[PDB]
Design a binder for this molecule. Structure first.
Ligand code: HEC
Length: 129
């Protein structure tokens, strides 16, 4: 299940999804922020398929690291871990009519490979600084 997959994330984003200041951005309380943007759920899938780099801000703090791709996960595994980070800390509560992540959403985005620099560009297109 998604919680089991999340073990592959926990080393960085931590068991409680609160991250490490300056090093690993929080997921708890921040996934909602992303989902709130038009294109936000697609962006979350792209991070997992293609990785991320570049300076970003989360809850007013700056991050400047690199996240690897997790494309070796299957479509259902990526769907499951994203549902985990969307629900485990209540972020989806904050979001009106959250539909759970599904395998075909991941499949569709795998069809167009992006670089981690292009993933950062997608993040910026969301209105996120
Ligand atoms: C440490 C080696 C990491 C592991 C394992 C995972 N992630 Fe990560 N992630 C990491 C960093 C350093 C960053 C920021 C990169 C930067 O440009 O500074 C991230 C980013 C994310 C994001 C995006 C958050 C945003 O505000 O844009 C998500 C949603 C994300 N990471 C989730 C995630 C998941 C679900 C992982 C396991 C499947 C995972 N990450 C692994 C570092 C590391």
């Amino acid at each position: 299940d998604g919680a089991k997959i999340y073990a592959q994330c926990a080393g960085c984003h931590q068991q409680n999804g609160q991250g490490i200041p300056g090093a690993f951005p929080p997921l708890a309380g921040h996934v909602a922020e992303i989902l709130a943007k038009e294109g936000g759920r697609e962006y979350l899938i792209l991070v997992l398929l293609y990785g991320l780099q570049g300076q970003i801000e989360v809850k007013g703090m700056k991050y400047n690291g690199v996240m690897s791709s997790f494309a070796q996960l299957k479509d259902e595994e990526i769907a499951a871990v994203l549902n985990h980070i969307a629900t485990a800390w209540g972020d989806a509560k904050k979001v009106k009519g959250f539909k759970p992540f599904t395998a075909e959403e991941v499949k569709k985005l795998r069809a167009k490979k992006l670089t981690p620099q292009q993933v950062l560009a997608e993040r910026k297109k969301l209105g996120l600084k």
